[PDB]
Amino acid sequence: MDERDALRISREIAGEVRKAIASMPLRERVKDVGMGKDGTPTKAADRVAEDAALEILRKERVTVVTEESGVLGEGDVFVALDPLDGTFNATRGIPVYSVSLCFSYSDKLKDAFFGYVYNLATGDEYYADSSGAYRNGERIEVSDAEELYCNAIIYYPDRKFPFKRMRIFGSAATELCFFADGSFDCFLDIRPGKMLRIYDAAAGVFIAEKAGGKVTELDGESLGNKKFDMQERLNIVAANEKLHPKLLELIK
């Protein structure tokens, strides 16, 4: 498969997931039926979103991994997917929630060849291939702010920080993209309990990297060895190359 292929497939998933969730009234969304591993009842929203995406994924030569369904199938192409990042927002009419799709030629992030994040509330489409990172088809770049007094997304501020603004919108996939288009100057998920799962990170990280951002673990390590497995976990430090080392000295 090529990017060209992943982009077609991803737009078809977006299209269906929107269809499925949208129809679903608020009280629909907020009901539970399932069994999240780490601790959660599969709401109505997540299963209806998962159902749309998988049936479209099951028809290609890929291996699909999600929090819910976990792992199964077979394909030389791996896809770390979250049918609905921001379920809390979706069940309350807060317009920040997305489907995230990252395609890889191996089981590691290092060989990902396509990233896709679609805001299922507004229709904003983010993606990236070897040819650039895009928002609604327009190419995008990260900002180039070099001082700590910047616009940050941070999970979770623990003490006083030097930032000009701090935001927390509840959909890391989408927020990684807010970073990628330069809307915010950095993205941080520095929580000690490391709760960020590879599904919500992969595409956002891939798209941010294509946009020019430097995206590492807390330690500054490279996310390449991060795996498309059920128990992978991530802390993330993300900014342009000038600001990134300053952030590491700050949270040091």
Place this chain on the structure above:
Amino acid sequence: MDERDALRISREIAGEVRKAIASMPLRERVKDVGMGKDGTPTKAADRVAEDAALEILRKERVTVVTEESGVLGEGDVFVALDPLDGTFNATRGIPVYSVSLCFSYSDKLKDAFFGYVYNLATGDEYYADSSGAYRNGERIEVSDAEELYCNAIIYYPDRKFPFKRMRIFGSAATELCFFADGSFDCFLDIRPGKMLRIYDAAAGVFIAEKAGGKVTELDGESLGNKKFDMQERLNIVAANEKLHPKLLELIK
């Protein structure tokens, strides 16, 4: 002028401000249009919403107050107005920004008789009058959460906290409405460097109270004496009756 009149005028203003902003590509929204008085440069998106809101409002017998224009007019009915709360989001296409209006029979918040907050991004309509609080024509009420492990909006997290989630969306008028309809369990602005202005707090406070919430300054003092035209920056603790006292004790 009564609550029926206030509802009619607010609806007229929100229609024109949405149309004016909706037709503005982000590139134009984010432009500077020269510095204001007690503030920074003005963004093009602020002046366009401000021109549209004032051209309707100033035709009424009121004293209008806005951050950007100060006190205008001499009616005995005061209106606290933000034509665009959440300009940062609006200029980056983040769908959380609104027009906010609080009508009072004096310049003090305690004489408020109408509050209105319209999300210019989503067309959601929040309002409150003597009959209660509404979202898109349907009565709302705050949640009955009583534990500290709750869903909180908070400016800004500064230590370890016991909450289930912390969020920061960048439009307090809207965020107070997210609290008003039970989407979040509390709204906290505890910043020692106070920034929240009466133009962005007043309507959301009026609506949240009509929905059954308790809303005060950090020490538990009433906000009824805050004035639209003799302004103080605020800190706020807002929650239902059971949860509020616990939050007061916590944030110490």
